[PDB]
Amino acid sequence: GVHRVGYTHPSTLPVPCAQRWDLRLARARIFQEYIEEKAPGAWQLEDERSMSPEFKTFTGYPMREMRPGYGQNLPDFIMKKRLPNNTHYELFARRDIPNEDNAMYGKYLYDMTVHGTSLPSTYRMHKDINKAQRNDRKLSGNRFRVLCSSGAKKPPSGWEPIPDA
Amino acid sequence: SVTGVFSKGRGIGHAAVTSILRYIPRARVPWQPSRFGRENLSASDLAVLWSRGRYRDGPGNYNSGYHTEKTHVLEDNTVTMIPKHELEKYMPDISIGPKALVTPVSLMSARNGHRVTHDLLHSYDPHIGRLDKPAVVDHDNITVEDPNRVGLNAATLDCRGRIYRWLRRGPFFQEDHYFRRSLRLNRDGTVPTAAHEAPLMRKIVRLAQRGHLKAACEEYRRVTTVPPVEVYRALTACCIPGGLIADAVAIFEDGNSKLFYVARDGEVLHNVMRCAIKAKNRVRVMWVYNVMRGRYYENVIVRAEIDPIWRYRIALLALEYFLDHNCAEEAGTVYSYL
Amino acid sequence: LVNKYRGVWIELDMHPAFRVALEPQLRKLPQGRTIPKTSVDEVISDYINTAHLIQDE
Amino acid sequence: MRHIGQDVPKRHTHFVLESRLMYEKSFRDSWLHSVCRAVSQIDEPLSKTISGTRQKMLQRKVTCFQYNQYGLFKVPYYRLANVDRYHAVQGVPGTREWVPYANVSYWTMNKMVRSGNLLVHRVHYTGWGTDPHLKKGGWEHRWNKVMQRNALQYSRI
Amino acid sequence: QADRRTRHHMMLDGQINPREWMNWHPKEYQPWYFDRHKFLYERQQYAHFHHLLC
Amino acid sequence: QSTEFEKRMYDIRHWLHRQTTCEFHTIYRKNVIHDGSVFPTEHDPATPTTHDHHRMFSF
Amino acid sequence: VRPDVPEDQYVDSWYVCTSMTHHLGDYRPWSASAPPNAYRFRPYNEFDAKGREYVEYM
Amino acid sequence: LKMAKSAFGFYLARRGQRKFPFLRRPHIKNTHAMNLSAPYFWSFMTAKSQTYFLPEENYITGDWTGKFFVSKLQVYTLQHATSGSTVRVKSFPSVFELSSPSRWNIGKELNTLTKPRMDLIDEQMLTKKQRLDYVKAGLLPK
Amino acid sequence: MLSQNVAKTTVPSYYMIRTNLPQRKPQNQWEGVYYFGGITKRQRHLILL
Amino acid sequence: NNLEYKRYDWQGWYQRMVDVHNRNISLRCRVSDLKRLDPNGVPFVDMQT
RNA sequence: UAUUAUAUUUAUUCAUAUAAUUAAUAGGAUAAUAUUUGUAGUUUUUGAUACCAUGAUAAGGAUUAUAAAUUGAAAGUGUUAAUAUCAUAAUCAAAAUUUAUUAUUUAUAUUAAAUAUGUAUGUGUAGAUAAAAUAAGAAAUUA
């Protein structure tokens, strides 16, 4: 029924006793519990599928809030929300790069340590071997695309390239 | 003959060096010896390579906001840039300024090590945003144009090696390298005591001297640079009456070996010894006499030794505690050093 | 090394009678990891005034 | 760039680093954004220390700050790209083409099981599986059991 | 512009082309240091005598 | 609790087998002191901490 | 299709639609997985899988 | 897909009439925006709690040189009618300027105002096949 | 110059693109991680002095 | 960890992720072992307490 | 011939992609000392691209069976390992239906959380079409 939440002091009764809302206040003080005051009394729903063992999925803990007006938009949600700092999103981030060796070290450093030189990719050395051979049997199909052209359009003081045949 | 994207570049070392350097060759990369990276770009071309290379928060994009071009052709339809002055009539400008991207140093751990909020991640180590000069993270002019090219760009030339370095970054990366890239002992042999920490250090020493321990500790929670030794003197001094051996030992250890051994001073050790007395701790008296004895590393390398008169005062306090506490064996040990 | 002194360590080898007797003097001179901003004249003037009465070479 | 000296076969495989640094910026702005949303939205008085007029001016200032937080990552985590590291295939999370635990798509992951690149155990195609949870209550049940252990079991202090 | 000393070449003039990176054993790519200042018998050309050195 | 045995236990973290790892759960008895000055068991105050002192961000 | 022998001796192979034994073909018969003369190779010849647990609950 | 409307049609398959999880879509094709929902006007395709702060195509967060067009995510307000300025939405094909301002627009986003799927279709983009197809479904006569 | 710096990579070939062989050594499991505990010649001379 | 995240660039931050995931510290106490006497001579916690 | 049954049931209104620069290593406290605090030689090449650029794993029932047994196959369906020589097209929110290869909620109560489909009342209603003998319950015309 529409009942006014009343709470009489431990002084009015002709026997004092610690009253339960004051105990609620002491507990929301000790463990920093937000007391949501718009909490209506008619909505003490429990998740039967999770709280009631007459379903295949009895969990015992209310695995969710039976509350349709829910979303991350709410501050009461944002309060009790685990943040993605140090979560699987980070682990995936810091180990899921297309090449895995580039997550254990730097490729040039590993190369200059175990070999001497810093080696290309398998794909690059494919391109370079094909260059080595398709410019062995034939020529005049290439192009000259560079990052910087100033040194090609402008060779050094010497370096007069050879005309082939 | 050649279709090339970059016309011209720039040398990293200058001719007061190169003209003597060139006479030995460089053992270059076998498969592509000439390496026209990002450092060699011009200023303007690299401003292009820095403007672009982000999704909507690199100004290279026509509708990114900090974009330079006024015209953009959308499939043979021209759109022109509505400037800020036309725009503010319906998008009222709120621009706090360059201080609104730099979080306080007390929110680094909450923001996962960072202080900036830029699109471009700001590593605090040198070797990551290093363009030609090592990238210094100046938190006072962090723009969206980003002139200093210190940002950990997303889609720039030579970005892959640095993105890999960023993902292989350490556990404590921003904090450790940000600490050490600043705040180092000056060749005068002195500890880095600064200007902006002096008033906060006054707050701490006054509160702790008054005995407001947790108040001084909440303020110490704001010690960004190093405190002078007296701040630890007071923050340990406050503990004496209540016998807070635990809080006191932790106040000692925070400068001891963590902050260039500021806390290794005879009077701070004396305060912490007093706390060991009032907490009745035979093992903490000996721990404090142990830090007093020191070892070679502190006593010589970091040169945080204690004046012999203070050594003696602390030793007499140890003996006065112990032979008053009947701890004959350990008192005899300290007198052995005497 | 992060914490090395980065400078020549002028060891103060005074006796525990004079390190107390000359205290206001050396309090304005460079002690361990401490260099007060005092003036070289002040320190040299004290050294010329006082040090004669000091009976220890 | 401009296809000169490409070291990888998939030019789109730069998007995986792009995404992982998207994730980094999300972790970096996450706490700030969540506290900003909380304080800007809070209607019932914050505390006995900040209330009312101060609440309105403070709320609006922190909203101004959440707006001035340039570089902020407020795109929801279900809305970021989700691509396979290996062959740059994208997979829509929530549907069969997304292996969750290996962060791969139906395609590359199918390749990696029909060749020996992952260690999985083939189980029957029509049934439910070996996990008694996944047999018991479908998929929301294993969701419940996972959250129950990662969060709900701690009697949080 | 481009020449038989720039273009990628497996074979150059009847024998192998040394200039192209891709015609070499990787053991030549290893890091090594100069010997010519050491004693003549301690150099890389007297490799088979390094075990006998006094 | 024998820290020496625990030392002998921790370095199974290395001689463990192939593709096999170890999480160590330790549940060890401790002593936490309750103490008078600092954590007082005093009476309730005069002014009562109502629900306002525990609202959102009041924590 | 594989020896009649306590199934915990087999392991389901990976990648191979077969089943191999963790000890490489070395076998121990059903009667090694039971007490001596165990009735139906029961753990204790008293009751079956649900008889044991419930005698125990009572 | 089949006819690459974008460069991502070059990159993404179709998967037939693939059934999707409720509200999980890699392409947010808000094909329902201009939906008059009479008693639900400040609710349908709008922000949820009436007392919300504005979205963020509504404040110049930094020192911009300017922009070419606003999003539909910036609400329509008094400054969008009275200031009579240029507010552009990237709609098909290039942009759509809200140059005939009115007051009923005030309060909502411009999504309820920028038509996503047009009733007029240009056969100038359709194929020799798509045109017969739109005749088939009843869009263009023939 | 040094002997043990022998080729651990092969002649850059097509057996990299055509075969499943591993272009990098498989990580060991019973190997520690390489740390530095060690005093130099000068450093030992210092302690002995 | 001792398989793969034992040793390289990722060893550090994986050790971080691990020990943070495990950072929980459960404290169990026996209320019967709160049923003791305060050295004041008062039982530390009685039935009402 | 025997070692053994389909003529029944439930079905059909079907749609979603976007705003160019992928070329490298660089260790920081409780460690007996590197400012290496802040490690500066530009510009000789070109394929996985908007473009030819080999390979390699699906969907599809019609006669190896009854007991301690499963009613899902190799013929390869977009992304993958050697052919080069037109052009940067790649998700960080808000998005443009022509795409055969799709099971929609049906008249007591109808918009509260990242926003979430305003159209098609009509005799269950042309033509041709879908599925299934498996915890449901089916029974008789072999090549």
PDB file of N, CA, C and O in Angstrom, chain B residues 75-126:
ATOM      1  N   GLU B  75      32.899  15.122 -56.017  1.00  0.00           N
ATOM      2  CA  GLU B  75      32.395  14.489 -57.233  1.00  0.00           C
ATOM      3  C   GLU B  75      31.799  15.536 -58.181  1.00  0.00           C
ATOM      4  O   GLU B  75      30.623  15.498 -58.550  1.00  0.00           O
ATOM      5  N   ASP B  76      32.656  16.489 -58.543  1.00  0.00           N
ATOM      6  CA  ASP B  76      32.286  17.607 -59.406  1.00  0.00           C
ATOM      7  C   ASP B  76      31.229  18.496 -58.754  1.00  0.00           C
ATOM      8  O   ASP B  76      30.414  19.116 -59.440  1.00  0.00           O
ATOM      9  N   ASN B  77      31.216  18.564 -57.423  1.00  0.00           N
ATOM     10  CA  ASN B  77      30.469  19.599 -56.714  1.00  0.00           C
ATOM     11  C   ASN B  77      31.419  20.273 -55.736  1.00  0.00           C
ATOM     12  O   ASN B  77      32.068  19.598 -54.929  1.00  0.00           O
ATOM     13  N   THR B  78      31.508  21.598 -55.826  1.00  0.00           N
ATOM     14  CA  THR B  78      32.407  22.385 -54.991  1.00  0.00           C
ATOM     15  C   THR B  78      31.713  22.728 -53.678  1.00  0.00           C
ATOM     16  O   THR B  78      30.556  23.164 -53.667  1.00  0.00           O
ATOM     17  N   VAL B  79      32.423  22.515 -52.572  1.00  0.00           N
ATOM     18  CA  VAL B  79      32.042  23.002 -51.256  1.00  0.00           C
ATOM     19  C   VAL B  79      33.174  23.883 -50.753  1.00  0.00           C
ATOM     20  O   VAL B  79      34.350  23.601 -51.007  1.00  0.00           O
ATOM     21  N   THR B  80      32.816  24.966 -50.077  1.00  0.00           N
ATOM     22  CA  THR B  80      33.807  25.891 -49.554  1.00  0.00           C
ATOM     23  C   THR B  80      33.698  26.016 -48.040  1.00  0.00           C
ATOM     24  O   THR B  80      32.632  25.847 -47.448  1.00  0.00           O
ATOM     25  N   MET B  81      34.822  26.351 -47.423  1.00  0.00           N
ATOM     26  CA  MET B  81      34.966  26.235 -45.983  1.00  0.00           C
ATOM     27  C   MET B  81      34.252  27.362 -45.266  1.00  0.00           C
ATOM     28  O   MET B  81      34.669  28.519 -45.350  1.00  0.00           O
ATOM     29  N   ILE B  82      33.201  27.024 -44.530  1.00  0.00           N
ATOM     30  CA  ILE B  82      32.558  28.006 -43.665  1.00  0.00           C
ATOM     31  C   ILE B  82      33.508  28.284 -42.505  1.00  0.00           C
ATOM     32  O   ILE B  82      33.790  27.381 -41.704  1.00  0.00           O
ATOM     33  N   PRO B  83      34.027  29.499 -42.379  1.00  0.00           N
ATOM     34  CA  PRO B  83      34.996  29.784 -41.318  1.00  0.00           C
ATOM     35  C   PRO B  83      34.335  29.877 -39.952  1.00  0.00           C
ATOM     36  O   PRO B  83      33.110  29.919 -39.804  1.00  0.00           O
ATOM     37  N   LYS B  84      35.192  29.928 -38.934  1.00  0.00           N
ATOM     38  CA  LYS B  84      34.766  30.129 -37.558  1.00  0.00           C
ATOM     39  C   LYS B  84      33.860  31.336 -37.391  1.00  0.00           C
ATOM     40  O   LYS B  84      32.913  31.265 -36.606  1.00  0.00           O
ATOM     41  N   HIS B  85      34.117  32.438 -38.101  1.00  0.00           N
ATOM     42  CA  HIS B  85      33.356  33.655 -37.844  1.00  0.00           C
ATOM     43  C   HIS B  85      31.930  33.545 -38.367  1.00  0.00           C
ATOM     44  O   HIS B  85      30.998  34.056 -37.739  1.00  0.00           O
ATOM     45  N   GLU B  86      31.734  32.885 -39.500  1.00  0.00           N
ATOM     46  CA  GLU B  86      30.383  32.561 -39.928  1.00  0.00           C
ATOM     47  C   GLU B  86      29.755  31.490 -39.057  1.00  0.00           C
ATOM     48  O   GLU B  86      28.533  31.491 -38.872  1.00  0.00           O
ATOM     49  N   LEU B  87      30.574  30.599 -38.500  1.00  0.00           N
ATOM     50  CA  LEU B  87      30.048  29.423 -37.826  1.00  0.00           C
ATOM     51  C   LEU B  87      29.562  29.738 -36.421  1.00  0.00           C
ATOM     52  O   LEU B  87      28.539  29.203 -35.981  1.00  0.00           O
ATOM     53  N   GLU B  88      30.276  30.608 -35.710  1.00  0.00           N
ATOM     54  CA  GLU B  88      29.976  30.880 -34.312  1.00  0.00           C
ATOM     55  C   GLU B  88      28.576  31.421 -34.121  1.00  0.00           C
ATOM     56  O   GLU B  88      28.103  31.504 -32.986  1.00  0.00           O
ATOM     57  N   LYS B  89      27.911  31.800 -35.203  1.00  0.00           N
ATOM     58  CA  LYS B  89      26.558  32.309 -35.087  1.00  0.00           C
ATOM     59  C   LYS B  89      25.572  31.189 -34.793  1.00  0.00           C
ATOM     60  O   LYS B  89      24.405  31.459 -34.493  1.00  0.00           O
ATOM     61  N   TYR B  90      26.012  29.935 -34.900  1.00  0.00           N
ATOM     62  CA  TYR B  90      25.187  28.798 -34.525  1.00  0.00           C
ATOM     63  C   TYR B  90      25.949  27.689 -33.824  1.00  0.00           C
ATOM     64  O   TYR B  90      25.319  26.778 -33.276  1.00  0.00           O
ATOM     65  N   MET B  91      27.279  27.741 -33.812  1.00  0.00           N
ATOM     66  CA  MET B  91      28.106  26.752 -33.117  1.00  0.00           C
ATOM     67  C   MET B  91      28.942  27.512 -32.100  1.00  0.00           C
ATOM     68  O   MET B  91      30.170  27.615 -32.251  1.00  0.00           O
ATOM     69  N   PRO B  92      28.319  28.054 -31.054  1.00  0.00           N
ATOM     70  CA  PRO B  92      29.032  28.981 -30.174  1.00  0.00           C
ATOM     71  C   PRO B  92      30.317  28.378 -29.634  1.00  0.00           C
ATOM     72  O   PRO B  92      30.325  27.294 -29.046  1.00  0.00           O
ATOM     73  N   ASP B  93      31.412  29.101 -29.853  1.00  0.00           N
ATOM     74  CA  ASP B  93      32.757  28.611 -29.584  1.00  0.00           C
ATOM     75  C   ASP B  93      32.978  28.498 -28.086  1.00  0.00           C
ATOM     76  O   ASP B  93      32.810  29.475 -27.353  1.00  0.00           O
ATOM     77  N   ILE B  94      33.364  27.312 -27.636  1.00  0.00           N
ATOM     78  CA  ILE B  94      33.935  27.124 -26.309  1.00  0.00           C
ATOM     79  C   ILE B  94      35.333  26.570 -26.539  1.00  0.00           C
ATOM     80  O   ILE B  94      35.518  25.438 -26.986  1.00  0.00           O
ATOM     81  N   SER B  95      36.342  27.397 -26.292  1.00  0.00           N
ATOM     82  CA  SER B  95      37.734  27.004 -26.491  1.00  0.00           C
ATOM     83  C   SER B  95      38.511  27.411 -25.247  1.00  0.00           C
ATOM     84  O   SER B  95      38.976  28.549 -25.141  1.00  0.00           O
ATOM     85  N   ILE B  96      38.640  26.479 -24.306  1.00  0.00           N
ATOM     86  CA  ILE B  96      39.372  26.760 -23.079  1.00  0.00           C
ATOM     87  C   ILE B  96      40.813  27.135 -23.377  1.00  0.00           C
ATOM     88  O   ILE B  96      41.399  27.970 -22.681  1.00  0.00           O
ATOM     89  N   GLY B  97      41.407  26.532 -24.402  1.00  0.00           N
ATOM     90  CA  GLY B  97      42.755  26.853 -24.796  1.00  0.00           C
ATOM     91  C   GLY B  97      43.729  25.704 -24.634  1.00  0.00           C
ATOM     92  O   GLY B  97      43.346  24.542 -24.455  1.00  0.00           O
ATOM     93  N   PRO B  98      45.025  26.024 -24.682  1.00  0.00           N
ATOM     94  CA  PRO B  98      46.051  24.971 -24.686  1.00  0.00           C
ATOM     95  C   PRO B  98      46.188  24.237 -23.365  1.00  0.00           C
ATOM     96  O   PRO B  98      46.839  23.185 -23.330  1.00  0.00           O
ATOM     97  N   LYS B  99      45.603  24.754 -22.288  1.00  0.00           N
ATOM     98  CA  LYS B  99      45.666  24.090 -20.996  1.00  0.00           C
ATOM     99  C   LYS B  99      44.566  23.054 -20.822  1.00  0.00           C
ATOM    100  O   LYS B  99      44.606  22.282 -19.861  1.00  0.00           O
ATOM    101  N   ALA B 100      43.593  23.022 -21.730  1.00  0.00           N
ATOM    102  CA  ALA B 100      42.456  22.111 -21.659  1.00  0.00           C
ATOM    103  C   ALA B 100      42.736  20.746 -22.264  1.00  0.00           C
ATOM    104  O   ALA B 100      41.832  19.906 -22.296  1.00  0.00           O
ATOM    105  N   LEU B 101      43.937  20.518 -22.783  1.00  0.00           N
ATOM    106  CA  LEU B 101      44.326  19.207 -23.266  1.00  0.00           C
ATOM    107  C   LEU B 101      45.330  18.540 -22.352  1.00  0.00           C
ATOM    108  O   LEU B 101      45.565  17.340 -22.495  1.00  0.00           O
ATOM    109  N   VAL B 102      45.913  19.272 -21.409  1.00  0.00           N
ATOM    110  CA  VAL B 102      46.984  18.759 -20.561  1.00  0.00           C
ATOM    111  C   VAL B 102      46.427  18.461 -19.167  1.00  0.00           C
ATOM    112  O   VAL B 102      46.275  19.359 -18.330  1.00  0.00           O
ATOM    113  N   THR B 103      46.124  17.189 -18.918  1.00  0.00           N
ATOM    114  CA  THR B 103      45.572  16.780 -17.640  1.00  0.00           C
ATOM    115  C   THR B 103      46.612  17.005 -16.543  1.00  0.00           C
ATOM    116  O   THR B 103      47.802  17.160 -16.826  1.00  0.00           O
ATOM    117  N   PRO B 104      46.187  17.084 -15.289  1.00  0.00           N
ATOM    118  CA  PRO B 104      47.162  17.194 -14.203  1.00  0.00           C
ATOM    119  C   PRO B 104      47.995  15.939 -14.055  1.00  0.00           C
ATOM    120  O   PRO B 104      47.574  14.846 -14.438  1.00  0.00           O
ATOM    121  N   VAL B 105      49.190  16.093 -13.486  1.00  0.00           N
ATOM    122  CA  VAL B 105      50.080  14.960 -13.300  1.00  0.00           C
ATOM    123  C   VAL B 105      49.516  13.988 -12.274  1.00  0.00           C
ATOM    124  O   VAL B 105      50.018  12.867 -12.137  1.00  0.00           O
ATOM    125  N   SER B 106      48.480  14.391 -11.543  1.00  0.00           N
ATOM    126  CA  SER B 106      47.859  13.482 -10.589  1.00  0.00           C
ATOM    127  C   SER B 106      46.754  12.665 -11.238  1.00  0.00           C
ATOM    128  O   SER B 106      46.047  11.923 -10.552  1.00  0.00           O
ATOM    129  N   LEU B 107      46.562  12.811 -12.547  1.00  0.00           N
ATOM    130  CA  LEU B 107      45.629  11.966 -13.278  1.00  0.00           C
ATOM    131  C   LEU B 107      46.318  11.119 -14.329  1.00  0.00           C
ATOM    132  O   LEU B 107      45.647  10.548 -15.188  1.00  0.00           O
ATOM    133  N   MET B 108      47.643  11.027 -14.290  1.00  0.00           N
ATOM    134  CA  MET B 108      48.348  10.187 -15.252  1.00  0.00           C
ATOM    135  C   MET B 108      47.935   8.729 -15.119  1.00  0.00           C
ATOM    136  O   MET B 108      47.572   8.076 -16.105  1.00  0.00           O
ATOM    137  N   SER B 109      47.973   8.210 -13.903  1.00  0.00           N
ATOM    138  CA  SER B 109      47.620   6.819 -13.695  1.00  0.00           C
ATOM    139  C   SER B 109      46.144   6.563 -13.977  1.00  0.00           C
ATOM    140  O   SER B 109      45.771   5.460 -14.387  1.00  0.00           O
ATOM    141  N   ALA B 110      45.295   7.556 -13.776  1.00  0.00           N
ATOM    142  CA  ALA B 110      43.905   7.376 -14.141  1.00  0.00           C
ATOM    143  C   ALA B 110      43.694   7.429 -15.648  1.00  0.00           C
ATOM    144  O   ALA B 110      42.782   6.770 -16.155  1.00  0.00           O
ATOM    145  N   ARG B 111      44.515   8.183 -16.376  1.00  0.00           N
ATOM    146  CA  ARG B 111      44.428   8.256 -17.826  1.00  0.00           C
ATOM    147  C   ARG B 111      45.391   7.297 -18.509  1.00  0.00           C
ATOM    148  O   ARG B 111      45.699   7.471 -19.689  1.00  0.00           O
ATOM    149  N   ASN B 112      45.912   6.318 -17.773  1.00  0.00           N
ATOM    150  CA  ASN B 112      46.780   5.282 -18.344  1.00  0.00           C
ATOM    151  C   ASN B 112      48.130   5.848 -18.765  1.00  0.00           C
ATOM    152  O   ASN B 112      48.646   5.532 -19.838  1.00  0.00           O
ATOM    153  N   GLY B 113      48.710   6.692 -17.924  1.00  0.00           N
ATOM    154  CA  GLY B 113      50.038   7.201 -18.163  1.00  0.00           C
ATOM    155  C   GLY B 113      50.102   8.534 -18.861  1.00  0.00           C
ATOM    156  O   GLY B 113      51.113   9.228 -18.735  1.00  0.00           O
ATOM    157  N   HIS B 114      49.057   8.940 -19.553  1.00  0.00           N
ATOM    158  CA  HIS B 114      49.150  10.111 -20.400  1.00  0.00           C
ATOM    159  C   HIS B 114      48.908  11.386 -19.610  1.00  0.00           C
ATOM    160  O   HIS B 114      48.424  11.362 -18.477  1.00  0.00           O
ATOM    161  N   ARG B 115      49.310  12.506 -20.216  1.00  0.00           N
ATOM    162  CA  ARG B 115      48.897  13.832 -19.792  1.00  0.00           C
ATOM    163  C   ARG B 115      48.154  14.597 -20.872  1.00  0.00           C
ATOM    164  O   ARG B 115      47.237  15.355 -20.548  1.00  0.00           O
ATOM    165  N   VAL B 116      48.512  14.415 -22.134  1.00  0.00           N
ATOM    166  CA  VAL B 116      47.865  15.098 -23.243  1.00  0.00           C
ATOM    167  C   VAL B 116      46.535  14.410 -23.511  1.00  0.00           C
ATOM    168  O   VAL B 116      46.218  13.390 -22.889  1.00  0.00           O
ATOM    169  N   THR B 117      45.738  14.985 -24.405  1.00  0.00           N
ATOM    170  CA  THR B 117      44.520  14.343 -24.869  1.00  0.00           C
ATOM    171  C   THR B 117      44.453  14.357 -26.390  1.00  0.00           C
ATOM    172  O   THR B 117      43.444  14.008 -27.002  1.00  0.00           O
ATOM    173  N   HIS B 118      45.561  14.711 -27.028  1.00  0.00           N
ATOM    174  CA  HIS B 118      45.626  14.830 -28.476  1.00  0.00           C
ATOM    175  C   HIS B 118      45.145  13.550 -29.163  1.00  0.00           C
ATOM    176  O   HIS B 118      45.200  12.450 -28.608  1.00  0.00           O
ATOM    177  N   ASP B 119      44.639  13.714 -30.387  1.00  0.00           N
ATOM    178  CA  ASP B 119      44.562  12.579 -31.300  1.00  0.00           C
ATOM    179  C   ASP B 119      45.893  11.857 -31.343  1.00  0.00           C
ATOM    180  O   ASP B 119      45.961  10.641 -31.138  1.00  0.00           O
ATOM    181  N   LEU B 120      46.962  12.592 -31.596  1.00  0.00           N
ATOM    182  CA  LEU B 120      48.283  12.008 -31.677  1.00  0.00           C
ATOM    183  C   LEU B 120      48.800  11.698 -30.285  1.00  0.00           C
ATOM    184  O   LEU B 120      48.986  12.593 -29.454  1.00  0.00           O
ATOM    185  N   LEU B 121      49.013  10.410 -30.035  1.00  0.00           N
ATOM    186  CA  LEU B 121      49.577   9.955 -28.778  1.00  0.00           C
ATOM    187  C   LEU B 121      50.905  10.657 -28.546  1.00  0.00           C
ATOM    188  O   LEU B 121      51.668  10.887 -29.490  1.00  0.00           O
ATOM    189  N   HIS B 122      51.166  11.025 -27.299  1.00  0.00           N
ATOM    190  CA  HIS B 122      52.400  11.698 -26.920  1.00  0.00           C
ATOM    191  C   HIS B 122      53.187  10.800 -25.977  1.00  0.00           C
ATOM    192  O   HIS B 122      52.952  10.801 -24.766  1.00  0.00           O
ATOM    193  N   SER B 123      54.106  10.033 -26.539  1.00  0.00           N
ATOM    194  CA  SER B 123      55.092   9.289 -25.782  1.00  0.00           C
ATOM    195  C   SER B 123      56.045  10.266 -25.125  1.00  0.00           C
ATOM    196  O   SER B 123      56.402  11.287 -25.710  1.00  0.00           O
ATOM    197  N   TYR B 124      56.482   9.942 -23.918  1.00  0.00           N
ATOM    198  CA  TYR B 124      57.389  10.830 -23.215  1.00  0.00           C
ATOM    199  C   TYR B 124      58.844  10.446 -23.399  1.00  0.00           C
ATOM    200  O   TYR B 124      59.725  11.252 -23.083  1.00  0.00           O
ATOM    201  N   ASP B 125      59.121   9.260 -23.923  1.00  0.00           N
ATOM    202  CA  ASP B 125      60.489   8.904 -24.237  1.00  0.00           C
ATOM    203  C   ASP B 125      60.942   9.676 -25.469  1.00  0.00           C
ATOM    204  O   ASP B 125      60.121  10.248 -26.189  1.00  0.00           O
ATOM    205  N   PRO B 126      62.250   9.731 -25.730  1.00  0.00           N
ATOM    206  CA  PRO B 126      62.719  10.484 -26.895  1.00  0.00           C
ATOM    207  C   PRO B 126      62.574   9.747 -28.208  1.00  0.00           C
ATOM    208  O   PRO B 126      62.170  10.361 -29.198  1.00  0.00           O
TER     209      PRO B 126
END
